[model samples]
Structure formats: C-alpha cells, structure tokens
Target: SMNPPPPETSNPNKPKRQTNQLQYLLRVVLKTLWKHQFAWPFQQPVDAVKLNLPDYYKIIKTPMDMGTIKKRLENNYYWNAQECIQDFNTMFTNCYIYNKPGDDIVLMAEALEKLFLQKINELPTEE
Candidate 1:
C-alpha cells in the first residue's frame, strides 16, 4: 500500500503553506480590543466619569442630563470602530499573501462590517 501524505505544517515560511486568516484576524481584533479596553486614553476618558460621585449620581438619576454622556460614549464607540477597521485592513494586507478566498475569513469580515454599520445606525448622525 502507498504511504499517506504527511500532515500540513502551520509555518508560513514553508512551501505550500496555508494561512488561517480568520484566526489571524480574530487574534488581531482581540488584541486591539484588549489594548484599548485597558490602555490610557480609552480607559482614562471613560473612567473619568466616575471621579465625581455626586455628578455621576446626578447624571444617572436625572435622565435628561444623560444626553451629553450619551454623546461622548457614542463618539468613543465611533472612534473605536474606525480604529478596528484600520487594524483589520492592515492585518488583511499583510497576511493574505496567497490571494485565495477563505470562507471563515469572509464570514468574520462580514461580521465586523455589520458591527460597524450597526454602531453607525445607532449613533447620533449630526456629530
């Protein structure tokens, strides 16, 4: 009986290598989210709202006064969405060397696209 072909390698440098682009994109998205969620500007601005307990409580108790806070939060979400798109584009350009279509990658990309669209739909358009 003929011997079976060997299992494929994960190394990108090897010949006939296949990349798990979906996994790579997901990894990048997770990293970006982690960094933004934990880092200076992103965390600082959001957390600043908690610095004044009186004001914070007032804002929460008074529903009409929430407009400003809601606007700021929406702006932050918009900025984050743009940043995510830029990062994903970079990942795609750098890693998609084979130019082959991948179902998983396509699906993940579509999901990300939809998320941005949904955010845009929900946010105040004037700003």
Candidate 2:
C-alpha cells in the first residue's frame, strides 16, 4: 500500500491530474482489499459516524482516517509477506500519529501499544 497524494503537487501544470490519479489508485487498492478472502482478526460493525461521507472525504483528502486503516488491511488480508508489510507501513504511518501532550500522551501510548500487541499476537506465527 502506498501513501495518498499531496494535496497540491509541486508541478502547477498537473497537480489536479496527479492528485486524481493517486485517489483512483487508493480507491482501487481499498476496494480490492475489501473482497479479500482471509478473515480479519477483529470483527466489529462499521460505525456510521466513524465512516461517514465526511470521514471518507477526509481519508482520501488528507490520507487519515480509521476507515483507511481498515481498508488497507482488508485489501491485503491474504496478500504475500511483502504486500502485507507495505500495507502495514502505509496504514501505521498515517494512522498512528500521537499528538497529545504529557500524561495523556503516556496513557494513550500505553493503551494503543497494548491494543497493537494483542492484534499482533493474533497473527499466525511460524513455529
């Protein structure tokens, strides 16, 4: 999985075109993942509030949203190792930014780490 496009490209002549291309690519990747065969580790109903039109707009616009995270993993559910790693990098980098301060940051970090650890443990590991 690759990162989304820049809001504005450095080249003035083709910024919109490039951005559109990026969006198209991301949509294809996400949709492809959605139909993947493997089951996800956690199954939760999609929250309409968390995945509304605004959220979809934000995700494709700024490349940040929980739906994007879910989409990436869903896209690569039965992918090869390299594909999985690439998708994970893209999803984690965009979705895991922690900007809170002080104690809140610590608590949030710990909680997030625990959640991630649990998910990782659920992965099938080689003996």
Candidate 3:
C-alpha cells in the first residue's frame, strides 16, 4: 500500500561531516574500545549454557559485543557515527542488566564506558 509523502520537519543548519571522514572516526573509536583492558569480557557473546547462566539469554534479548560490533562495522551496518556509538552503549547496557551492580564485570563495563565517553568527547562532533 502506498502512503502520502511525509510532512517536512526540515532540520536547518545541521552541518555534517563527509561519509568517509565519519567512517574513519567510527573505526578509530571502535578499535579504541576493543583494545581497552576492560574489554575482555565483552570481546565475544556470552556462552550462557557454558557459564551456567540460564537467565542470561532470557534477560539480554539483543546481546551486543565487541566482535559483533566489529562485524557490523566491516559490513557497513551503521549509517552514521551515532549508530555505531549506540551499539557500544547497548553492549555495556547488556552487561549491566545481566550482572549485579557490585559484580566485577559490571565494574569493568563501567570503566570501559567511561573511557568510551572520554574518547567520544575528544572527537570532532557534527555541528
């Protein structure tokens, strides 16, 4: 079924970087996150059965990890820098949901999140 053309809510004066430049920035940020010391736990998907956490898969419906993010990046699954950042945020949020606040993995996730925010803050954002 065809629908009428959507109304225009034109976003004015929103300058953006070229696709290639934005791609480079995304790659750099993802690599930095992957290389961090606290990134080990998030390097791959959780083996719920092996780890004996039967509830993991149940709670984390959209599980995200460094490996998956890298795959998506290489495959051009993201349309913009923020899309890539959103995945990283999802990965950390997954960890927080599965693990308790005082857990070691949660602590590591928090540290990595902090580093990611710092790196993002240093980048040249779209105006």
Query: Per-prediction RMSD in angstroms?
Result: 22.7, 12.6, 9.6
Q: What would the per-residue lDDT of candidate 2 be over residues 20-87, giving only the tens digit for each residue?
A: 22333345433343343321311222233544433433443333333444543434332233333343
Ranking by TM-score: 3, 2, 1
State which candidate has the highest TM-score.
3
Each model's TM-score?
A: 0.24, 0.32, 0.77
Worst 10 residues of 1 by lDDT: 60-69
Candidate 2 residue spans exceeding 4 A from truth = 1-64, 77-100, 103-106
Q: Model 3, 68: alpha-carbon shift in Å?
A: 0.6
Q: What residue runs in model 1 are displaced by over 4 Å at the alpha carbon?
A: 1-85, 88-99, 125-127
lDDT-best of 1 and 3: 3
Indicate the TM-score of model 1: 0.24
Error of 2 at 105 (Å): 5.9
lDDT of 2: 0.36
**Per-residue lDDT value at 52 in model 2:** 44
Model 3 lDDT tens row, 16-95? 33465356545677788888888888887777766777777668777777787776666556658786688889989988
